[PDB]
Amino acid sequence: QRKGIILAGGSGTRLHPATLAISKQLLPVYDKPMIYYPLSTLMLAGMRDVLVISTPQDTPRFQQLLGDGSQWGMNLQYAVQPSPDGLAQAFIIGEQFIGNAPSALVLGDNIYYGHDFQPLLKAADAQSSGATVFAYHVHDPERYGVVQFNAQGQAVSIEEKPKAPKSNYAVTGLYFYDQQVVDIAKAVKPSARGELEITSVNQAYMQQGQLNVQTMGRGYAWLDTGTHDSLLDASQFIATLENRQGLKVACPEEIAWRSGWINASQLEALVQPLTKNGYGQYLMQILK
Amino acid sequence: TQRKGIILAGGSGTRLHPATLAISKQLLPVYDKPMIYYPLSTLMLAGMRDVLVISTPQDTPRFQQLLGDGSQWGMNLQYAVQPSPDGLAQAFIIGEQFIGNAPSALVLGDNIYYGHDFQPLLKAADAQSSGATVFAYHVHDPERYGVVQFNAQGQAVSIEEKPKAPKSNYAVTGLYFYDQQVVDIAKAVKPSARGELEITSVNQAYMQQGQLNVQTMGRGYAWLDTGTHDSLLDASQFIATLENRQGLKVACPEEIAWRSGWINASQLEALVQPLTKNGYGQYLMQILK
């Protein structure tokens, strides 16, 4: 079975002074901490074992929020990235956690929503070999890293903020890998930015012809969490869908229950501290 | 002004979980800044440089790391702890040594105010020589608040805590100004029918002496509900609207301290050097030039 990693990196001064008090990935997006969203993405793909990698200052904060995950039928582990030396180090730090299993990496600030998102994840999870990146259709591909892929979904090029974009599909912060990634990451050399870039990992799979692309088009949302304005917009987006459509985005208790990881009695125990708000009353509605 | 201010930032409750599993409520961002900046800036607008932050044993260090001793803003910030959430009136018992023989003010850590004329309104409450001043705000559901009736001369006729049965639509907000009597009054407060050492009991004592004045925050004033996730999002939308649409800045302590003369432009430009990346710091740059 596949094991997941959440990389929650340095908050930056970009969100000060709000992030003077809390790390970015602990800020609330509507009613729940940001980290719930990338976590529930791993949960939707079927992963119960997740390693949270963060900075020395922020890792204990995540441990306080989430614990060991056994409340969701999960096994959560924590490790620290001491210096922000690139995304690919997640596979070096998480090497013992991964073992010989397939893995997945999601960035701590990536919020996805789509009606068919779970089938898309399970299809990527079902791939026997190679790697999978997740592309999001944008009207301005120049701003992101852009992936070009062939009619069968196999990546042909990956270009960072291309002046002339070869496609309209931006690479998002979600990656699935077979057993080769731990060794591939170890051979990554520091880029012009001084970091072990995940793009170099994806380049190795593509150069081997083993990099597949899942496209998130019509029906999908990929929210920007970079600025105060965009975070407020992300909060409004979640509140709109949840209040209008009678659903919850990134509710770990619900996902664990619907997946069979906890029973209805365990879910009712989790709801007792949440009875005061719509989050807990939502869970009580599905119990009845 | 020798008036000394208190922010009561006590227990948040599970009402905002799971957001508040990670941080206490008064550290959540309301748009671009921690919630505590808003009530703090309210005390600063009224002229108070000495502020006591009262919080829980667990949360007081987190506020200490955020705000420090306030000397970066020409203020003096002190800290004290409320070990159990027994009543707003306990703020004056915990705050007795900080207050001394000075007039005082109490604001709640989750109270966000805005008004174009709010500062003259605060300065007027500060200038009252005696008695107490509460702030009245029109609500559609007075049953959830403290409710006050007043005689147009600013004198209260009655004040009731969560009445059944509300005698008016004017809620008493979480902002209170007091003379030197409040500590002893607060010490004599008995637990209410809801088992709380209520600030309404304190205000009832002032009213029975004919010393309870009422300032109206009417048309143009906002008093934001921070009780629920929906209401918190409404509060962020509101702050963002004023700042993005009207070029206004709500609750920027750096700005207030500078315009009040508590720091000079050199001290303010030094504060912006670590904040240069965002629009918050660029605003401080824009007003400096």
What is the C-alpha to C-alpha distance for residues B63 and B12, in angstroms, rounded to an integer? 14
Take residue B178 and report the two structure tokens written for it: 């007091």
Spatial contact of A179 and A101, defined as CB atoms under 8 Å apart: yes
Q: How far apart are CA A193 and CA A172, in angstroms?
A: 19
Cα distance from N-terminal residue to C-terminal residue, chain A: 32
- For residues A6-40, one letter each, b for 16 or more C-beta atoms within 10 angstroms of the residue's C-beta and e for the rest, the string is bbbbebebebbbbbbbbbbbbbbbbbbbbbbbbbb
Residue B195 tokens, joined:
């088992």
B248 touches chain A (CB under 8 A): no
- Locate the chain B residue with the closest alpha carbon to A228: B32
Three-class secondary structure of residue A45 per DSSP: coil
Helix (H) or strand (E) holding B174: strand B170-178
Cis peptide before B186 (omega within 30 of 0): no
Distance CA B215, CA A12 (A): 42
Kindly write down the DSSP assignment for every residue of B231-259, as one continuous string. HHHHHHHHHHHHHHHS----S-HHHHHHH
Identify whether the C-beta of residue B262 lies closer than 8 Å to the C-beta of residue B255: no
Q: Tell me the count of A-B CB pairs closer than 8 A.
A: 107
Q: List the single residue in B17, B240, B274 with the smallest CB-CB distance to A274.
A: B17
Query: What is the β-pairing status of strands B4-9 and B104-108?
Result: parallel
Q: Please check whether residue A288 is in contact with residue A257, taking contact to mean a CB–CB distance below 8 angstroms.
A: no
Cα–Cα distance measured from residue A174 to residue A7, given in angstroms and rounded to the nearest whole number: 10
> Do the chains contact at B66 and A21, CB–CB below 8 Å?
yes
DSSP code, position A221: E
Q: Quick one: closest CA in B to A253, which residue?
A: B18
Q: Strands, E, within chain A: which ranges?
A: 3-8, 28-29, 32-33, 49-54, 75-80, 103-107, 111-114, 131-137, 145-149, 155-160, 169-177, 211-216, 220-223
- Which residues in chain A touch residue B27, judged by CB atoms under 8 angstroms apart? 21-22
- Tell me how far apart the alpha carbons of residues A78 and A50 are, in angstroms, rounded to a whole number: 9
Q: Does A277 touch chain B (CB under 8 A)?
A: yes
Among residues B67, B62, B35, B32, the alpha carbon closest in space to that of A14 is found at: B32
Distance (Å) from the alpha carbon of B39 to chain A's nearest alpha carbon: 15
CATH code at A262?
A: 3.90.550.10
Question: Do A30 and B233 count as a contact with CB atoms less than 8 A apart?
Answer: yes
B275·A232 Cβ contact <8 A: no
Beta-carbon separation of B18 and A36 below 8 A: yes
Distance in angstroms (rounded) separating the CA atoms of residues A109 and B139: 38
Q: Which two tokens stand for residue B125?
A: 């409450």
Instruction: Please tell me the distance from the alpha carbon of residue A66 to that of residue B21, in angstroms, as a whole number.
Output: 9
Question: Is the Cβ–Cβ distance between B206 and B154 less than 8 Å?
Answer: no
Q: Quickly tell me which residue has 């920027």 as its tokens.
A: B252
Rounded alpha-carbon distances, angstroms, from residue B164 to A53, B41, B190, B208, B214: 52, 34, 21, 22, 22
Contact A13 B277 (CB under 8 A): yes
In chain B, residues 66-125 whose CB comes closer than 8 Å to chain A: 66
Chain A residues with CB inside 8 Å of B275's CB? 13, 16-17
From chain B, the residues in CB contact with A11 under 8 A are none
Phi first, then psi: what are they for A97, rounded to 5°? -60, -45
The three-point CA angle B265-B269-B273 to 5° equals: 175
The total number of structural domains in chain A stands at 1
A65 touches chain B (CB under 8 A): yes
Of all residues in chain B, the one with the smallest CA distance to A24 is B29
Give the resolution value in Å.
Answer: 2.3
Alpha-carbon distance of B109 to B167, in angstroms, equals 27
Q: Which amino acid is at B197?
A: L
Contact in structure between A37 and A29 (CB atoms under 8 Å): yes
Q: Which residue has the tokens 């304190």?
A: B202
The answer to whether residue A61 neighbours chain B at the CB level (below 8 Å) is yes
Instruction: Determine the distance in angstroms separating the CA of B133 from the nearest CA of chain A, rounded to an integer.
Output: 32
Contact B78, B95 (CB under 8 A): no
Q: What is the dihedral of CA A78, A84, A85, A90, to 10 degrees?
A: 20
Q: Does A12 touch chain B (CB under 8 A)?
A: yes
Tell me the shortest Cα–Cα distance from B261 to chain A, in angstroms: 22
Report the alpha-carbon distance of residue A7 to residue A52 in Å, rounded: 6
The vertex-B88 CA angle with B212 and B54, nearest 5°, equals: 120
What separation, in Å, do the N-terminal and C-terminal C-alpha atoms of chain B show?
30
Contacts of A46 by beta carbon, 8 Å cutoff, 6+ apart: A1, A2, A121, A122, A125, A259
CA dist B53 → B70, B76, B139, B226 (Å): 11, 11, 28, 19
Under 8 Å CB-to-CB from B75, ≥6 apart: which residues?
B44, B49, B50, B51, B257, B262
Whether residue B165 lies within 8 A of chain A, CB to CB, comes out as no
CA distance A119 to chain B (A): 27
Structure tokens at A244: 């209008």
Structure tokens given for B148? 């006050």
Contact status of B25 with chain A (Cβ, < 8 Å) = no
Q: Which residues of B touch A232 (CB under 8 A)?
A: 31, 236-237, 240
**Cα–Cα distance, A175 to A173 (Å, whole number):** 7
Q: Are B158 and B208 a contacting pair, CB within 8 Å?
A: no
DSSP per-residue codes, B41-102: HHHHHTT--EEEEEE-TTTHHHHHHHHTTSGGGT-EEEEEE-SS---TTHHHHHTHHHHTTS
- The answer, for A228 touching chain B at a CB cutoff of 8 Å, is yes
**Inter-chain residue contact B278 with A14, CB threshold 8 Å:** yes
Residue B233 touches partner A, C-beta closer than 8 Å: yes
Q: What share of chain B is helix, strand, coil (3-state, %, to 5)?
A: 40, 25, 40
Measured in whole angstroms, the distance separating CA B127 from the mean position of its chain's CA atoms is 18
Contacts 24+ apart (CB under 8 A), B273-280: B274/A13, B274/A16, B275/A13, B275/A16, B275/A17, B276/A13, B277/A12, B277/A13, B277/A14, B277/A16, B278/A13, B278/A14, B278/A15, B278/A16, B278/A227, B278/A228, B278/B32, B279/A228, B279/B32, B280/A16, B280/A17, B280/B32, B280/B33, B280/B252
Shortest Cα distance, chain A CAs vs residue B233, angstroms: 7
Decide the pairing of beta strands A220-223 and B29-30.
unpaired
Structure tokens, A200: 């170099």
Its domain, for residue B46, covers 1-289
A276 touching B (Cβ < 8 Å): yes
If phi over 0 gives left and psi between -120 and 50 gives alpha, with beta otherwise, what is residue A170?
A: beta
